[PDB]
């Protein structure tokens, strides 16, 4: 399993740095390596669970399209097919986004492995703390995607219940809400891909500069990628605030639909749609 061998090598290298730091006496490097190696384990475990929920979402959206076609409602089946296609495009973008983030971590840890092996302990500590911030930022993106997945799953359940209850207006309005949530996630993936590629370029500068002996250039480039990751985290914190404001609206739509007040549930999903379109 190539998806399993690359992760094992990443964790093995960092754990090897922690053992070498302890025998040499650098506990700051040891505690930084041990914590970074653990953050990678949690990012891998959280990534595996994130992949399963996304597959589950795609099955549900496709399941609705096949069911709505058999029940006669064709306009809802086309809307679910359009929603499913964008969910697939969103997942494929996340795959390339994940593939570039993994390369980010590998390059940084390669800098840390070479810096610690060549004696530059201050450069090795700088690389490991940048690697940890990159993993922490990735975990914050994984948790945020899971929050987005929950928004989609709740909306998909409303559309299925409304479809089986003959409430096509609420079913179409829900799928449209789930549709915009996927479009908003796509636009966030596009802007993130532009940032991650920019960070890859800067990290390749530090790796080559260290191998060629430009230590001052290597530290400044590695330092530049650190604040780029930190600046990206601060911007993502604001996006998390809006999503929580959307989840509260979906809970109002859930409670209005289960209690029969369908007019309040439609107004709630409509207000949530305007907020989603404004996010990105």
Residue numbers in the entry: 0 to 279
Please share excerpts from the published article on this structure:
Crystal structures reveal repeating interactions between protein and peptide interactions as designed, including ladders of hydrogen bonds from protein side chains to peptide backbones.
Here, inspired by natural and re-engineered protein–peptide systems, we set out to design proteins made out of repeating units that bind peptides with repeating sequences, with a one-to-one correspondence between the repeat units of the protein and those of the peptide. We use geometric hashing to identify protein backbones and peptide-docking arrangements that are compatible with bidentate hydrogen bonds between the side chains of the protein and the peptide backbone. We design repeat proteins to bind to six different tripeptide-repeat sequences in polyproline II conformations. The proteins are hyperstable and bind to four to six tandem repeats of their tripeptide targets with nanomolar to picomolar affinities in vitro and in living cells.
